[PDB]
Design a protein around this nucleic acid. Structure first.
Lengths: 137, 42, 197, 54, 188, 234, 171
RNA sequence: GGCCAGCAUCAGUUUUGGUGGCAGGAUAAAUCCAUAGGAAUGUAGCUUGCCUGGUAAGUAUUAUAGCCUGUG
RNA sequence: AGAACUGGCGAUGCGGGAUGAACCGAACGUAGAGUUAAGGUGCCGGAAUACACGCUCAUCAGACACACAAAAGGUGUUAGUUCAUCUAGACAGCCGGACGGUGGCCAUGGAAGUCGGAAUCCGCUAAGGAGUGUGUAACAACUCACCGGCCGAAUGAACUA
RNA sequence: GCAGUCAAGCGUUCAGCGACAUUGCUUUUGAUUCUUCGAUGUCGGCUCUUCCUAUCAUACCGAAGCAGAAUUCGGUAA
RNA sequence: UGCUCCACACAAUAUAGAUGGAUACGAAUAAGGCGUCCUUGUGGCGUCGCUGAACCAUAGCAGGCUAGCAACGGUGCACUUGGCGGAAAGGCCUUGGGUGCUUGCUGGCGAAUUGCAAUGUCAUUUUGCGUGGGGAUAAAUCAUUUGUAUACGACUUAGA
């Protein structure tokens, strides 16, 4: 074909309205929305729904999530919070496999010893059925 | 004078080898093969 | 945690990999390095060749035989680099070095064993984009290594065999995953999901 | 290919002391020999305000 | 200053298509096809309207911008060669000893043979690179035309052909015998 | 550029850039002539030999011809009605597109237009134009004039320009002892063909001034009437 | 340490028949009150014949940023006396607050010109009111509509010494 | 009664966490609500050219987004 | 070099600067616990391949004393200072003009701007310098200082770190 | 070496310092040189190993009136 | 009647140091793994990383004696069928049944006294005496002797 099949080269771009997850500091594990850009390495974020106060944070401590929503440039806390509810980014993040894995690991860390024994018994029961299915096809 | 590691002399020797030089060795080996086969045929 | 750790030398840095392996050996963790011929060193090829030639120029004037030994194989180059960071002259250093094995390519039985990498020593992660680098195999060949062609054929054969093995394993894992997904939605599956599994 | 010798970078503390003494003498010599504004920078967007204040 | 992002525009004519991998660039068109491995350049490609491709470097320095520009130039050269092609005309001049040029064939290498240069008995063989065809000109006496799709291959072949007839140890101010590239142009 | 930048080719020439002073002087001169003369004309002379320009200028000593940068002349005449020097003068300035060109004279309009219609002079090929007629170099020794006149009157080409013929004009020339020779007849142009830069340069070197030229005037402005008229005589 | 802006005032001691001194005021960037007072005294001594022993500090108050959550463009007067004689220097920094801008300016000066804190004097720090007044390209670049760019070559910090995944960077 | 240890609660030295109540800042500044104005890296709408429903530039200071200044 | 004051070494262990009479730290009984100096935290080597901003690709950088070689030079790099041109179209790219008195005066076999010596005067311009360079015996021709036409917007010159 | 000129620059606050160039120095007709004046301390040689390029020659090149031959300088080269 | 291979029978010997499993495609990092569709390609779609905080296994006197239910699976062991592996293969895949366990599910019996913990002994590297079971009965050196050799050492042949 004559079309330019050249790869699209998809990239997670940092932009106004992008929602990111903080991986360090007191606000670790909380979502924040980028409001404005300070420089090539520093950005302004606001996560009032997540409870993180507005502050300037280096991109080194921030990882960009695939989710994005429209935010006017320089939007204050009230506007950012309103757009957060309008876009329902929290529900989309929860439905994402990343949040599912985070919640799964968090629950695993808190599992009780009796809960651990129950998990082992359930895993054995599931394995029994799974191996019964195998060799029968 | 030119040494063994002289590129021009080595190239000339290689060209000579591709010339009748290698054909002579090929003919010698072909002749030797006949006697090698005769050693078993006898 | 594993009794023996296999590290793939391809794409790694000589200095960082040697330092981490030396530190691990001193702690008692046995380590074996494979595919050392694919190891990389920072800087362009000419600088590494110049440094290797300068090192080779060192010899004992009155008796060349007993002077420094300039090993040409990539594995021995890595071994010398690691030994430079280890007090091999002591009994503890000798014991630590006995836990280390270095090979070019992946000879058996290591070809059948899992291979790991050191994130803090990867060339890609550490070296800035655009920075030039030199391959240990090319340097070894330029400095007298003659087994470069022999290793390539064995590496290709091992790659083909492992590709067939993975062709089998991918189908097996796909079948296992399909069976597990079919088993999903069961009471045991729901309980495991609610319990984090 | 036949790399020549490289200059050693060892300190050679004898040179340390020699250089220390030479620098001490040179500082005294310079001290003895001693006895014998740009305004408003350009490109400033609000440079006019300085003139207004003046 | 490490510009945030700089990009250049590459124009793809309707007659050719250019499929590009991570960094492997392939060009296909009426005259032929060409390939180039640019994995060492670390640049990005992106289609916009199926006829123009933008190559951009994010957080790239001055040297990175220069590399982007030369990548664009190489892509343009490949496109032109695929569409129009390149035609190199070489002329050999002799004063007393006629220069005999023939395209001999051995093992399919197709070496260009030059004989009797300045009366030398040595036979000079210039291998023909891939993708370049050499044909003796007609109606233009003492001229040989080299044509091909890749600029680099044809240019290197012409350079080697002219260099093989180097005049050694003689005064260049008097000995004008040699082979020179008379003119460079497109096949079309 | 901290370094690795372009270096200007400094030469010890006597002339220096005139600068904005010349532009201001021409602006003032244009605004003065706009009122000093009864009529204004816009002459679209893309290119002309300096002797021809001087001959045109001296053709009527009782008139002034103003030229220079097109933008300066447009600004002097005015770019918009809000600032035009004279009523409807913006319309006249809008019409200038080529290498203008501004003539101020009190002479009769009919006389000026008739003179411009009748005036004609020879000119070079001026590439980007259809060739006047075909020309072929003789299939032998090449002379200075290309053999247009009998070869007995012509002179062989000087060897100094042979490299110019080869590299620039792109003609397979070879050097002979006393002459420059070509093995086959070389056609430089054909009737009705678009003249390329190399062909035009070859024709100029051979001195083939077969092309005619006449100045192009797009319109004239009557200062007394203060109305633009689009006279388009060739 | 992290800089702070202090309002330092001096009322060089009132001698007989000269009560109510002029009460000179200054804005000093410093990590603590002591350093701010020391710099204020040094500047006062440099400007005129006053001295620390001849005067006293009226009041020291920290000037907090009015809008520490707003992105602003700052123009800073820079004068440093090293290595050669003092010369004017102007730099533009994009930052959320004046203190952050001053910290970045000092860090950049130390990185490039090797000028130390004691060797740098800050004359004026002014917020640029409107866009297009910024002159330096590296600041005007970010002042573009819908500015978006990627972060290629993402690197993940590994807590473990060994990794079985052969980590890949994405993209 | 001889040798070695653990547990409980104590005195001195000492190291690392959790947490509660207070005095100071511009009686923190922020965030946020109300209020009068301003602007564009101009929101909705309107206008000019294109036309594959939107597009490039003029308008329009809050409208089918918001931002900044001062005050309470 | 000749003097005055002030410390250490000698008689002095200990930690650090790899190695030491002068360098830094430092109050020498035998012991236990704790906190530090100077020096360090990739291994040898006990301690973060810690966090943040930049700087350098070196075909023997750098971790080297602050002093001799050292005055400068790099179409190697990053940031600054001072001057210029700019939609009366900035720099650089392509095409045209580059005139006429005139082939200006001395010599000359040849000397037309470009082998040599004094001038280096004036008209028309947007501009043409008794000529920036290549070449002809001689012009011719090519080209540059400037200007003109096409695109369009920042560009150029000297310095400092 | 000494004695002077000029300043690209630095600069008692920009009078003084000062880079690159430059004049006087120590029989113009290849003519002579028949001066060749004190080392208070050794130098010079038989066998034999290595190393440096600041390269005499061999090797590969550029610039020189390099027509050839032949010769000069320069780049790498132990 | 020595030697050599196997089983246990007990010892001596030490462990650069078990105390679940070293879990196997290759390549790039300005890119990739998996599933799917076709026209099988440098094609389209969905999905995933952002660490191994993973996957398997992990319940019973250091892991017993038994009574049942659901499947014809899972798993240790000796045979057995064929195939693959030479870079240090010294290992890997798999048919057939045979014999134990199966905590997948549901009951019974016993644990104690080591007294409130004392690693609380559970693995192999080697060596010998013993039996029970399979296999065959050799060379070198010293000395003499020839020299292709040599100070002596050393080297090379010959002699039931």
């Amino acid at each position: 074909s004559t079309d330019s099949i050249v790869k699209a080269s998809n990239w997670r771009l940092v932009e106004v309205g992008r929602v990111v997850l903080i991986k360090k500091g007191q606000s670790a594990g909380k979502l924040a929305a980028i409001v404005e850009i300070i420089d090539q390495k520093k950005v302004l974020i606001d996560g009032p729904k997540a409870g993180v106060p507005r502050q300037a944070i280096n991109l080194g401590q921030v990882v960009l999530t695939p989710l994005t929503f429209a935010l006017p440039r320089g939007a204050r806390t009230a506007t950012v919070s309103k757009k957060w509810a309008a876009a329902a980014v929290c529900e989309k993040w929860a439905a994402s496999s990343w949040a599912k894995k985070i919640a799964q690991r968090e629950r695993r860390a808190a599992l009780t010893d009796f809960e651990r024994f129950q998990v082992m018994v359930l895993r054995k029961q599931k394995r029994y059925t799974v191996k019964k299915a195998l060799a029968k096809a | 004078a030119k040494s063994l590691r002289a590129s021009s002399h080595l190239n000339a020797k290689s060209v000579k080898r591709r010339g009748v030089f290698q054909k002579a060795v090929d003919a010698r080996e072909q002749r030797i093969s006949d006697k090698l086969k005769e050693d078993l045929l006898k | 945690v594993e009794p023996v750790v296999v590290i793939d030398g391809k794409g790694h840095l000589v200095g960082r990999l040697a330092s981490v392996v030396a530190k691990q050996l001193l702690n008692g963790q046995k380590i074996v390095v494979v595919r050392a011929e694919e190891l990389n060193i920072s800087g362009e090829f000419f600088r590494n060749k110049l440094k290797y030639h300068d090192f080779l120029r060192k010899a004992t004037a009155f008796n060349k035989t007993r002077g420094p030994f300039h090993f040409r194989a990539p594995s021995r180059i890595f071994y010398k680099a690691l030994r430079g960071m280890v007090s091999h002259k002591t009994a503890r250093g000798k014991a630590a070095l006995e836990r280390l094995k270095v090979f070019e390519g992946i000879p058996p039985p290591y070809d059948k064993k899992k291979r790991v990498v050191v994130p803090q020593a990867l060339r890609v992660l550490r070296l800035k984009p655009g920075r030039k680098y030199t391959t240990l195999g090319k340097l070894s060949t330029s400095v007298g290594w003659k087994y470069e062609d022999v290793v390539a054929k064995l590496e290709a054969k091992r790659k083909v065999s492992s590709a067939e093995y993975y062709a089998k394993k991918r189908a097996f894992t796909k079948k296992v995953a399909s069976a597990n997904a079919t088993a999903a939605e069961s009471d045991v599956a729901k309980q495991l999901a609610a319990l984090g599994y | 290919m036949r790399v020549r010798k490289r200059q050693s970078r060892r300190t050679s503390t004898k040179l340390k002391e020699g250089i220390k003494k030479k620098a001490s003498a040179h500082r005294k010599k310079e001290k003895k020999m001693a006895k014998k504004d740009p305004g408003i920078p350009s490109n400033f967007p609000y440079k006019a305000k300085i003139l207004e204040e003046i | 200053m490490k510009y945030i992002q700089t990009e250049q525009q590459i124009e793809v004519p309707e007659g050719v298509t250019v499929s590009i991998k991570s960094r492997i660039v392939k060009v296909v068109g009426p005259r032929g096809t060409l390939t180039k491995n640019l994995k060492h350049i670390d640049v990005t490609f992106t289609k916009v309207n199926n006829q123009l491709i933008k190559v951009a470097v994010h957080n790239g320095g001055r040297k990175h911008v220069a590399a982007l520009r030369t990548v664009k130039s190489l892509v343009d050269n490949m496109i032109t060669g695929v569409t129009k092609g390149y035609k190199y005309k070489m002329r050999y001049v002799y004063a007393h000893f006629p220069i005999n040029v023939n395209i001999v064939e051995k093992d399919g290498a197709k070496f260009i043979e030059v004989r009797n240069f300045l009366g030398d008995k040595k036979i000079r063989n210039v291998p023909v690179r891939d993708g370049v065809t050499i044909e003796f000109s007609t109606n233009v006496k003492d001229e040989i035309v080299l044509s091909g799709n890749s600029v680099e291959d044809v240019s290197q072949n012409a350079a080697d052909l002219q260099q093989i007839c180097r005049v050694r140890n003689k005064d260049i101010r008097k000995f004008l015998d040699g082979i020179y590239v008379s003119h460079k142009g497109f096949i079309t | 550029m901290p370094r690795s930048k372009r270096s200007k080719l400094v030469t010890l020439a006597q002339t220096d850039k005139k600068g904005r002073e010349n532009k201001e002087r021409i602006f003032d001169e244009v605004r003065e002539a706009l009122d000093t003369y009864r009529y204004v004309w816009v002459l679209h002379l893309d290119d002309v030999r300096t002797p021809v320009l001087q001959e045109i200028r001296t053709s009527w000593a009782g008139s002034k011809l103003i030229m220079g940068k097109r933008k300066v002349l447009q600004k002097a005449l005015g770019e918009k009605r809000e600032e035009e020097y004279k009523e409807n003068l913006y319309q006249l300035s809008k019409l200038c597109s080529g290498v203008t060109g501004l003539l101020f004279t009190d002479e009769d309009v009919n006389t000026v237009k008739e003179y411009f219609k009748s005036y004609v002079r020879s000119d070079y090929s001026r590439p980007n134009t259809k060739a006047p007629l075909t020309f072929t170099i003789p299939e032998g020794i090449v002379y200075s004039r290309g053999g247009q006149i009998p070869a007995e009157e012509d002179v062989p080409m000087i060897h100094s320009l042979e490299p110019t013929m080869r590299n620039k004009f792109e003609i397979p020339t070879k050097i002979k002892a006393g002459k420059i020779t070509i093995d086959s007849p070389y056609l430089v142009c054909t009737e009705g063909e678009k003249l390329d830069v190399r062909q035009a340069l070859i024709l100029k070197q051979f001195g083939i001034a077969a092309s005619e030229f006449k100045v192009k005037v797009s319109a004239y402005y009557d200062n007394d009437s203060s109305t633009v008229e689009s006279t388009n005589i060739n | 340490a992290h800089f702070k802006e202090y309002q330092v005032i001096g009322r060089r001691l009132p001698t007989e028949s000269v009560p109510e001194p002029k009460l000179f005021r200054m804005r000093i960037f410093a990590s603590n009150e002591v350093i701010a007072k020391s710099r204020y005294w040094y500047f006062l001594q440099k400007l005129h014949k006053v001295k620390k022993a001849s005067g006293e500090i009226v009041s020291i108050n920290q000037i907090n940023e009015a809008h520490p959550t707003k992105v602003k463009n700052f123009g800073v007067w820079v004068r440093y006396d090293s290595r050669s004689g003092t010369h004017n220097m102007y730099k533009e920094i994009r930052d959320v607050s004046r203190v952050a801008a001053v910290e970045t300016l000092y860090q950049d000066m130390a990185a490039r010109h090797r000028a130390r804190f004691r060797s740098i004097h800050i004359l004026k720090v002014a917020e640029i009111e409107k866009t297009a007044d910024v002159k330096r390209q590296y600041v005007k670049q970010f002042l573009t509509k819908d500015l978006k760019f990627p972060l290629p070559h993402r690197v993940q910090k590994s807590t473990k010494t060994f990794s079985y995944k052969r980590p890949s960077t994405f993209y």
